């Protein structure tokens, strides 16, 4: 007497709110690395593009992601390809690599760092992300009161510090650079 449904997404949404550039993955070359590639994201999916030949070529669409992506920025560590720092509604900081694995280009998580609880809370430091232009630290900021800073390093493996913290009990952040 019940109703059992099967859900499919035929076409994905096209509200791209995150973008970042760099060289994320090697395509068809031995040692050629140029900052021509582009990764755009909606809240729920990521698309990689190439602009080397003067026009937007889609390289790869990825798997179905089940989270609300709130920030996405390129991460270039001093003395590697470019990484993706992401912050979603799971309450964690993710650092991600695009690799080639068994035929296909896919996503690979390198760091999952727990912050506060899940969903879009005003205390969760997932609204503002800003990366040091030399690749030394990730600055994360909530809408209200919390700011976090992670020192990120690479020696044989990507490594983050324990965070540095600002707690400002009534301040609603509007922008960050």
């Amino acid at each position: 007497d019940e109703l059992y449904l099967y859900h499919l997404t035929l076409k994905k949404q096209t509200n791209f709110v995150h973008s970042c550039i760099g060289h994320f993955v090697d395509l068809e070359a031995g040692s050629k690395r140029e900052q021509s590639q582009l990764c755009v994201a909606t809240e729920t999916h990521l698309e990689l593009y190439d602009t080397a030949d003067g026009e937007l070529k889609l390289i790869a669409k990825f798997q179905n992601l089940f989270a609300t992506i709130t920030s996405m920025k390129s991460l270039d560590l001093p003395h590697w390809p470019t990484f993706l720092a992401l912050t979603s509604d799971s309450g964690n900081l993710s650092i991600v690599q695009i690799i080639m694995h068994a035929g296909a280009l896919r996503l690979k998580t390198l760091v999952n760092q727990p912050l506060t609880r899940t969903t879009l809370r005003r205390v969760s430091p997932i609204s503002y992300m800003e990366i040091d232009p030399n690749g030394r630290c990730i600055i994360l900021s909530s809408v209200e009161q919390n700011k976090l800073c992670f020192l990120v390093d690479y020696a044989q493996k990507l490594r983050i510090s324990s965070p540095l913290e600002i707690i400002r009990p009534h301040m609603v952040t509007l922008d960050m650079a």
Partner: protein, 84 residues
């Protein structure tokens, strides 16, 4: 007395981490300020909910709508729009 002493000590830590806890002597002014600030975060925060509000207000960009929702957390913002 020690079980009652934990729940008092934990009410303070959770009230600092998450703003909108209350107890028994919460004023309606305090409670409604919590409800408003949570709701404005949601409208700003989910991006479908940004586009729904920005279109139906007829705003000029979606970023002008985000700053309207974030300035509205301030109690002195109704008077700012009224002093133009």
């Amino acid at each position: 007395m020690a079980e009652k002493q934990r729940q008092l000590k934990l009410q303070k830590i959770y009230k600092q981490k998450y703003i909108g806890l209350g107890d028994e002597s919460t004023t309606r002014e305090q409670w409604q300020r919590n409800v408003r600030n949570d709701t404005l975060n949601t409208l700003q925060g989910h991006s479908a909910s940004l586009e729904y509000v920005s279109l139906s207000r007829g705003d000029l960009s979606i970023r002008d709508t985000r700053i309207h929702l974030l300035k509205s957390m301030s109690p002195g913002y109704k008077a700012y729009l009224r002093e133009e």
